[PDB]
Q: What sequence folds into this?
RNA sequence: ACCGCUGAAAGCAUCUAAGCGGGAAACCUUCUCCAAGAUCAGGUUUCUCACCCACUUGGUGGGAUAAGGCCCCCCGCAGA
RNA sequence: CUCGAUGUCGGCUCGUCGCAUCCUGGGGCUGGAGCAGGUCCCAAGGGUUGGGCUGUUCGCCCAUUAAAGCGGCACGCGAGC
């Protein structure tokens, strides 16, 4: 996981959601997932 | 499950085991005990059993304590202590007036021994808490066994509670865990327990079957 | 759109409604449920199930489809249960059924044993294929996931436990 | 305040209503009355309530 | 001279407040007012007027879920690093009456009278109290429309 | 932290919004010690369970006892 | 602020706290085959060596170690040396 104050999708298939009051990106490619922090 | 007995520390000696290894043991005369009382959860709020140990002249017991013993129909003893059982009574395994001897334990089992450690009087920090002190030479002035600093400075302008200083040492309640019962001599009512036991020779000792085992 | 559908009743032998609560029994055992407050469960013209709620609120549009699909899953499972098929990969990795429990050989020094809880029945077909069965979809999925995570993912060789037809990621490494 | 709320009215509206009714007794004697003669205090509360406007939010 | 209560004028009574769905703050304010006796026209700030209050069903008080999760209770033992810390959730599981009485006591004046005023408070987790011999009247919370 | 199951808003998907799991020497019980001056001063028991005088007749002042202590005496591996 | 006085570096003794974590504990990603690692997230319970040189702090070196953490407290601590 990447943890940076700015998160945004990288490739075309990165979805961007917000679970438990925290913005994060989930994607099939495991090295793409990010969460704000 | 929890088994207990009251006895007297008779001193230490050594024996040799089957491997021809020397074993330092403490001789505990786990003499006969009488029950004298049962604590039920319904009446007291917890489950436990009193135990009476030690011989004493009946003229040495006042009227209230004598009445308590008479209520149980037992001749008065010197000592009296409660063995706390698990929060389940099971309402069994103990009768008032029943006798407990030393062979409630068996060879090779483990016990917890609690007693009253020896008194050391007013002790310094070097003995009581293992402080280092300052050096014996190179200019040290009258501080060889003194404690050193006891706090900070203007912040905080106080000494913290629980700072270790000199004071009375010993006479505490001490429990030693996982002592191996080397031999149970039922003839003399004697337990040979491998290791050391808190207290002076002749002091009251409580022996309990170990819970850590 | 989900939640704006009636729930058909193949059997629904003992469909009962008591203050946002419901119980359904049939060819298999019974299953209960309590519906969220702003949702109303009611009957259709053909004895079916329908749910409703006051219109156009975020908290109600969210609960609508959820409460619909939960009772739909419940009745579906009562009619026919849920089964999940799981494979095993890797040389020497295998599974056997030991009474009510289920044993795994997954390269550990010790063996791994999974006990089946109530309402769940295991069934082995081949030394490398088995199936977890039950009526409650959530419980079946939970047990399947517990069995799924028995080994850490292996992108290089691929050994471990997988679902049927799932495509795990692969890397070459050396 | 205690006596008024016992007679089901706030000190707030009791003072407004007494001034509207044109009663010029001061607080020392109102408190004295509340301690000594609760029937008279109830009568005063009735007068204040009667003189108070019908809707107090207009 | 304005009236000042004399020794022997104060008359006490017994109230029982049910905490089934009352929120903690409302219940605490009500109990504090009853204990101090501010509802009595004979009130005096230097006199321990007021009544006895029995609070039952202390485990039913309405506490928000986020408050159970996040409202935190602190005690310092006096030793370095001796700040110990619980949640309202753990307290409500273990000693529910302590939560109610702590909330009530925070709302009393911080002086010597409140030490004696808090002696008249009884809080119970269950639905029953042992003071049946005293005949406490039920007390529901009212708000005076204005 | 992280990994999930079931699952809408948003016909798909989503660990989450309803709900249910796994998860660390940190936290709480469990082990050891202190502790009812815990002034909400706790509990289970057992013993004494009794008088006299004065008086402004008082939840009054004195006097003498019980159960039980204390001081004194002989000591201690208890101890300034 | 303190000049009708608030003792100044280093060492010793005794500590206490923070976490921006050195080890041990838990994880995600990896240009992670395995052993080893890199990076980021969680985590402050305990631990965190002895010497040579220099007044030294610092630093370098020697021999080990799971590791030889960084800081605050009048650059903690002279009515304690
Ligand atoms: Mg020395
Ligand atoms: Mg000198
Ligand atoms: Mg000198
Ligand atoms: Mg000297
Ligand atoms: Mg200070
Ligand atoms: Mg999913
Ligand atoms: Mg205290
Ligand atoms: Mg100066
Ligand atoms: Mg001066
Ligand atoms: Mg951190
Ligand atoms: Mg890593
Ligand atoms: Mg490699
Ligand atoms: Mg630590
Ligand atoms: Mg701990
Ligand atoms: Mg330091
Ligand atoms: Mg300094
Ligand atoms: Mg000096
Ligand atoms: Mg110095
Ligand atoms: Mg100084
Ligand atoms: Mg000074
Ligand atoms: Zn992606």
A:
């Amino acid at each position: 996981v990447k943890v940076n104050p700015s998160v945004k999708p990288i490739c075309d298939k990165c979805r961007l959601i917000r679970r438990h009051g925290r913005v994060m990106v989930i994607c099939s490619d495991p090295r793409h997932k990010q969460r704000q922090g | 499950a929890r088994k207990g007995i009251l006895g007297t520390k008779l001193g230490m000696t050594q024996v040799f085991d089957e491997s021809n290894r020397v074993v330092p043991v403490t001789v505990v005369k786990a003499g006969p005990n009488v029950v004298t009382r049962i604590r039920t959860p319904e009446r007291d709020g917890y489950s436990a059993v009193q135990l009476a140990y030690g011989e004493i002249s009946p003229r040495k017991v006042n009227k209230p304590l004598t009445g308590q013993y008479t209520a149980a129909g037992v001749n008065p003893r010197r000592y009296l202590a409660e063995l706390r059982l698990d929060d389940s009574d099971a309402a069994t395994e103990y009768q008032v007036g029943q006798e407990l001897t030393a062979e409630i334990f068996a060879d090779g089992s483990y016990v917890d021994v609690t007693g009253t450690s020896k008194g050391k009087g007013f002790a310094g920090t070097m003995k009581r808490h293992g402080f280092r002190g300052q050096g014996a030479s190179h200019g040290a002035q009258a501080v060889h066994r003194r404690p050193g600093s006891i706090g900070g400075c203007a912040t905080p302008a106080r000494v913290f509670k629980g700072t270790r200083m000199a004071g009375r040492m010993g006479n505490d309640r001490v429990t030693v865990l996982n002592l191996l019962v080397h031999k149970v001599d039922a003839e003399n009512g004697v337990l040979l327990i491998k290791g050391a036991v808190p207290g002076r020779t002749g002091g009251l000792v409580m022996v309990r079957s170990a819970i850590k085992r | 759109r989900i939640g704006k559908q009636p729930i058909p009743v193949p059997a629904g032998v003992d469909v009962t409604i008591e203050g946002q609560s419901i119980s359904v029994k049939g060819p298999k055992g019974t299953l209960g449920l309590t519906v969220a407050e702003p949702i109303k469960v009611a009957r259709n013209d053909d004895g079916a199930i329908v749910v409703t709620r006051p219109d156009d609120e975020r908290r109600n549009r969210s609960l609508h489809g959820l409460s619909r699909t939960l009772v739909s899953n419940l009745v579906t499972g009562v009619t026919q249960g849920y089964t999940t098929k799981m494979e095993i990969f890797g040389v020497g990795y295998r599974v056997q059924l030991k009474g009510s429990n289920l044993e795994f050989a997954l390269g550990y020094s010790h063996p791994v044993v999974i006990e089946a809880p109530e309402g769940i029945t295991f069934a082995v077909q081949a030394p490398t294929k088995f199936t977890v069965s039950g009526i409650d979809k959530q419980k079946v999925g939970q047990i399947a996931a517990n069995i799924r995570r028995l080994r850490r993912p292996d992108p290089y060789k691929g050994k471990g436990v997988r679902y049927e037809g799932e495509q795990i990621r692969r890397k070459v490494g050396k | 305040n205690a006596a008024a709320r016992l007679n089901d009215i706030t000190y707030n509206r009791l003072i407004q209503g007494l001034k509207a009714a044109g009663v010029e007794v001061d607080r020392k004697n109102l408190a004295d009355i509340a301690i000594s003669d609760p029937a008279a205090f109830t009568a005063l509360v009735d007068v204040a309530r009667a003189a108070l406007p019908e809707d107090v939010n207009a | 001279p304005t009236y000042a209560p004399k020794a022997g004028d104060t008359t006490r009574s017994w109230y029982v407040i049910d905490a089934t769905d009352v929120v903690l703050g409302r219940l605490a304010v009500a109990a504090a007012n009853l204990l101090r006796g501010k509802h009595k026209p004979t009130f005096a700030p230097n006199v321990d007027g007021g009544d006895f209050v029995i609070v039952i069903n202390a485990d039913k008080v309405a506490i928000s879920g986020d408050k159970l999760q996040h409202k935190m209770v602190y005690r310092h033992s006096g030793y370095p690093g001796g700040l110990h810390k619980r949640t309202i959730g753990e307290l409500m599981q273990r000693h529910p009456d302590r939560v109610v009485e702590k909330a009530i006591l925070g709302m009393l004046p911080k002086n010597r009278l409140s030490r004696q005023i808090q002696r008249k408070l009884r809080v119970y987790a269950g639905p029953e109290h042992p003071h049946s011999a005293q005949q406490p009247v039920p007390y529901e919370l009212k708000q005076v429309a204005q």
Remarks:
- Chains D and C do not touch (no CB pair under 8 Å).
